[PDB]
Amino acid sequence: ETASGYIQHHLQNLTFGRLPNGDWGFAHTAEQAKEMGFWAFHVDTLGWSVLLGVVFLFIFRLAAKKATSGQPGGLQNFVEVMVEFVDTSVKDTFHGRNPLIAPLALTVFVWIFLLNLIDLVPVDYLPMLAAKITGDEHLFFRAVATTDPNATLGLSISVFALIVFYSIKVKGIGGFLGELTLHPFSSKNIVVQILLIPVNFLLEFVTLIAKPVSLALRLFGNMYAGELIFILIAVMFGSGMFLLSALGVALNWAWAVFHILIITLQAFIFMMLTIVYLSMAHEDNH
Amino acid sequence: ITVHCDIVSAEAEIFSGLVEMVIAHGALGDLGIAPGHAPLITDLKPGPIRLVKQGGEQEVYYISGGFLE
Amino acid sequence: MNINATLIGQSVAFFIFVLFCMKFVWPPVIAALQERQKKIADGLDAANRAAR
Amino acid sequence: MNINATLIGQSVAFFIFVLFCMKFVWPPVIAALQERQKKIADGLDAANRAAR
Amino acid sequence: METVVGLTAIAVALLIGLGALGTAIGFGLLGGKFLEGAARQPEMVPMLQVKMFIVAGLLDAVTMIGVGIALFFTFANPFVGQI
Amino acid sequence: METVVGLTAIAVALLIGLGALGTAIGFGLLGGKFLEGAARQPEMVPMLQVKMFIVAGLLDAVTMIGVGIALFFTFANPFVGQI
Amino acid sequence: METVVGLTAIAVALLIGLGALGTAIGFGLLGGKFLEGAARQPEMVPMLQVKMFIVAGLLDAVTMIGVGIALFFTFANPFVGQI
Amino acid sequence: METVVGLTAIAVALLIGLGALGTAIGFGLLGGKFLEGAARQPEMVPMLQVKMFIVAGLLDAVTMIGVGIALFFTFANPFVGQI
Amino acid sequence: METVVGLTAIAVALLIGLGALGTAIGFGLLGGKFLEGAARQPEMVPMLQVKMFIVAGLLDAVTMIGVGIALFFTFANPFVGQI
Amino acid sequence: METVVGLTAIAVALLIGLGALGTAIGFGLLGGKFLEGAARQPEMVPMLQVKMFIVAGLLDAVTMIGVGIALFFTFANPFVGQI
Amino acid sequence: METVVGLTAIAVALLIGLGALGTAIGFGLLGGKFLEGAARQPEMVPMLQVKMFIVAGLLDAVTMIGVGIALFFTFANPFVGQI
Amino acid sequence: METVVGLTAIAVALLIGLGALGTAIGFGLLGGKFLEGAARQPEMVPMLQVKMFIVAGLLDAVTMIGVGIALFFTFANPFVGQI
Amino acid sequence: METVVGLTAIAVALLIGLGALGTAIGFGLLGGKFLEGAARQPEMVPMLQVKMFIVAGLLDAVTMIGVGIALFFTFANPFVGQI
Amino acid sequence: METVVGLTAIAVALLIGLGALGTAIGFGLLGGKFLEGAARQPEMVPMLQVKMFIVAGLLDAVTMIGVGIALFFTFANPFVGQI
Numbered sequence A: 001e002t003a004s005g006y007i008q009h010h011l012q013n014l015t016f017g018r019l020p021n022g023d024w025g026f027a028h029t030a031e032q033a034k035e036m037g038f039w040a041f042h043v044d045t046l047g048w049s050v051l052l053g054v055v056f057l058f059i060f061r062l063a064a065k066k067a068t069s070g071q072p073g074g075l076q077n078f079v080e081v082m083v084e085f086v087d088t089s090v091k092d093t094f095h096g097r098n099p100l101i102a103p104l105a106l107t108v109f110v111w112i113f114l115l116n117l118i119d120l121v122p123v124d125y126l127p128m129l130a131a132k133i134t135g136d137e138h139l140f141f142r143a144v145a146t147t148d149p150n151a152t153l154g155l156s157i158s159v160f161a162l163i164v165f166y167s168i169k170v171k172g173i174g175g176f177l178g179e180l181t182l183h184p185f186s187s188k189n190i191v192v193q194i195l196l197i198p199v200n201f202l203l204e205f206v207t208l209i210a211k212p213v214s215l216a217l218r219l220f221g222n223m224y225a226g227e228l229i230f231i232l233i234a235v236m237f238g239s240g241m242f243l244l245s246a247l248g249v250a251l252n253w254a255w256a257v258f259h260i261l262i263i264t265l266q267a268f269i270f271m272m273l274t275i276v277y278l279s280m281a282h283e284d285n286h
Numbered sequence B: 001i002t003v004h005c006d007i008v009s010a011e012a013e014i015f016s017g018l019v020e021m022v023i024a025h026g027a028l029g030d031l032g033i034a035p036g037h038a039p040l041i042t043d044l045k046p047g048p049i050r051l052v053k054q055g056g057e058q059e060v061y062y063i064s065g066g067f068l069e
Numbered sequence C, D: 001m002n003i004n005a006t007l008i009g010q011s012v013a014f015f016i017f018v019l020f021c022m023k024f025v026w027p028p029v030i031a032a033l034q035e036r037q038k039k040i041a042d043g044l045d046a047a048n049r050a051a052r
Numbered sequence E, F, G, H, I, J, K, L, M, N: 001m002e003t004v005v006g007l008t009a010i011a012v013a014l015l016i017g018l019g020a021l022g023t024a025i026g027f028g029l030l031g032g033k034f035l036e037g038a039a040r041q042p043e044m045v046p047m048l049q050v051k052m053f054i055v056a057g058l059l060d061a062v063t064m065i066g067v068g069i070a071l072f073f074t075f076a077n078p079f080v081g082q083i
């Protein structure tokens, strides 16, 4: 095979959708997967996201169904350091009584961290283990779910629904459109307020729509560019040489030592913007 | 609008009362202080300080140095 | 690469894990956390009552 | 080699990375967790003494 | 087609590249004032942080409208449909 | 027609890219002074925030005209109908 | 014919893009000082606002000329007739 | 005939666009310090304002030659008669 | 076809180059404020260092969207398929 | 002759445009410091105004050489006589 | 062939030259603040030197990726193989 | 010969224009600090004015070489020789 | 042949030109703070000078790589051998 | 020999033009700090002047290589031979 073919294979997802004859089948080529329209599903993305979310909540439930209220065991000591860290992070930004904001921030931080952590395992291990267990030699299979723009867009379009929800739920329908059209510029004269509505709408509407997109594409860009460098460093070993398969180890090690900081930081930023953007939807900031 | 102002020496009070504006010679440049001004500290060079009030629009006092707070 | 698929699937899956954590995981942990603080507060207060 | 090589090269780099990771990343985190484990026991002792 | 498609790769590189340049200089100016404010008033750090993330929404808005039209030009093409 | 449509893709990238570059640096400068003022006078923060949004309208005014004309050149084209 | 029309779209992008870039940075610099002055003396804010608007007129003067020559090159192009 | 008229449309966008970029940044710098001085010396604003207009005349001096030459090239092209 | 391949090499250079330029200037601004804050009070260094990395995630956000797309244009190519 | 004449219009736009850009930013820097000094020490204003004009002559010196060469390339042409 | 080869030589100058420009301005900004802290606090030098090398790693991160993709383009060529 | 001659007219515009841009910004930075120093120490002005002229000789050194080479390429031509 | 050789001369000019531009700006930022520290703390100038030469090697690292690659392209063009 | 020579005049203009631009801005920053130090303590001038000339060597080092290479390509020509 060629370096171009090795790279082209690592960028394709396990898609399942409407084939030319029937709504039951996996695409065998990239073009056969691009033919499948918006009514399709990446089975590797949904298989890694759901499995890691259930592992996290099952482990956190094992330390909540039998909490001691006294001296903590090794497992619950960790779970409580995480709940205490998230609660402190929420109380330094949000002052209201909403019960959803704190467990949401814990779910967002721990889930994104686990979806990102699988990038540290070697890039050919999981793709080949899936092929050997299935009996195929052309199976598309991507492990890191945050390298799929649909997975990161799903996580932000869902936080955006909660922002539009809480904004209407506490400010009312009138208060929602009021912040969207009578803020930041207001005037007593009726002719002036009407001429300021388009200006207020351009300023406020652009900022609101940019929130979900920036949250999804900041996460996608740091993870997609992060795995691309690991795939490109693996081609240095494909050469078969000795003084190149030695330099490649140094780049892979240095990139993984740098990437663990990025993997930890991206989960924290997504949590903090979820806390900040939901807290500024509960009060009139102007 | 007015702010309370006092000019005090190590020995006794030189002035005490309400004023609308205070003008003085700071070590880096001249200043004009008015009610609601942000907290400021500075070293003053020898010269006259001018106070403004209704009727008392030119109350001038000579100072040999010191600090303005 | 960018192809729009599985967007609704991940959106629904996220709400399921969030509400599960809200009901089952979050309340018991905070109750256990508060009990240590309450027990220590009672202990320090009781030590002050003994001197008083 | 190619795929045969890339597989041994990746796994060798990963082994070298995991070696230092469990020698310099994991131990300080365990020490911070164990420090919290000793602090909750010493803090609770005072609340036990207050009953005496 | 060859020019309309090859001049759309330069269009994409200017929409994401000029935005990448302005957001890295803008957050480095904004952040330089946040770290000094955090030193002048150590007790104000949680307030300064929430206010910095409000400014961050205004700072990246036009840049994010450009990363979207650039992705729209990279996988769809409103110019190729005009021959 | 292929040269007019290809140059229009570059015109659109140049309109939004220069606006993204300008507003990101402009808000980095404006917002940096808002955090400096907020740290010295935490009582003035609600007043300073209203004055910051008055300036934000002047800073993005021309940039918005640019993105409005850029979108107009992609979904419509006043140059293609003039050849 | 196609070259003149194509190079008139690039002219419009430069007249509005360069204007937007300067205006955004200029109001970031001017507005930042307005917040610094407003924080120092909240008593002088009514006077500082009008003085900022005097400067705003000077700052946008040539930008407004360029945005009027760019909407003239777009509708009823003056160079097409010349050839 | 067509390359001279196409390149002169870009010459007009460079003359006005570079002048607009520089004058918008220049007045942001000059005007920012005018507001700082007005906040330090409320009683000197009528003295500082006349001094700001003396500098404003120097700041825009070359920019006004640029827009003067740009409008001359747009309505009375001096290069189309030289071929 | 050579125009699409040659203009992809320039698009890759502009997309990585404008990110290398913005990240080096943007972090040199933020980094200097971090060292200055460390000199004012070495007791707050662990906290300030954590705050610097929190801003580093906002500053390097879009520059990585361009480094990822550029590495996706050197090995893969969405413009060659479009002819 | 056509490409030499077309490229002389762009040469003139760069001479006057880069000169206009630099002179506006330069006087914005020199001017802001004059107003800062005038507000701080109003008795020095007569001297500071004379010292500003000594700098203003150095600041515009090369810009005025550029405008002199640009008018020469517009009303005469040293390149056309070289074929 | 010649267009891909000549336009990849210009892509190497943009990759290594734009990173050179950023790294030089970024280290003048960060080292200026290091020499300012070492004069203010000559006892914190050993600590501030370590914190400067940590931030140096963040500044020279996307620049080394671009200096390495540009040596890949001079000694190998991913574009030539695409015909 | 027509492309060599027309590209020496752009070479001359770049060579005088980039020099004018740098010299105008450079003297705005040097002169603004001279007015600040002159207001701070009125009795040191005779010495500060002589020291400013030492720096003015370093600031314009390469700009004068650029103007000298640009006049050499305008009235003589090391390229029309085709050598 | 001419397009590969001609574009190589411009690649060479971009590498040493962008490196010269960034190192001069960066060493004025760095050196400006060396003189500020030396005027305030004259007994520390021997230490500040050594700390400055440690930042000088970091500031010139990527620029010396560009200078070496530029001379290699001029006296050993690695692209002429690639057809 | 009409493309190689022509594009060599552009190369020479970029080498001296980007060098002149950076050197003029670099000395404005360095020299402005020399005058600030000379005004803070008038008796330190003899030392500050010698320290400024040490930095001036670091500042102009790469610009002098650029001027040397630009005069090499003007009177001799490596790329004329390479064909």
Ligand SMILES: [Zn+2]
Residues within 6 Å of the ligand: A179, A183, A284, A285, A286
């Ligand atoms: Zn509001």
